[PDB]
Symmetry: C5
Subunit: 30 residues, 5 copies
């Protein structure tokens, strides 16, 4: 189903967002 | 219908958010 | 119905988040 | 049901995220 | 099924994102 596929894409993009925020948090502490 | 369309819009906005976070991460590294 | 209304709220809050992140990116640049 | 409840939780967490980003934007400005 | 499980994963990743943003906000206040 189309909805299940779009939700898997949303979940993957959110994992990327969470990882980039961990990089930003570390860069701000040096 | 509307649910499938709104989830595609959510997925598109999340890609924009992921990209702007990668730009912010790069700006903090010069 | 209820599901579609909650998803429209989620979509609207995500547009707000995307815009605030664009503002942050501009301030840092 | 479970799906309606999880979507309400997602909407609520996104309002928190939107607020924290607005606080970050103000700190940087 | 699959959709309920994907939505629980999305909710969990969003709680992590909310936490990391609070850590970033505190670092930016020193």
């Amino acid at each position: 189903g189309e909805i299940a596929q779009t939700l898997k894409e949303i979940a993957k993009t959110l994992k990327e967002i969470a990882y980039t925020l961990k990089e930003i948090a570390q860069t701000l502490k040096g």
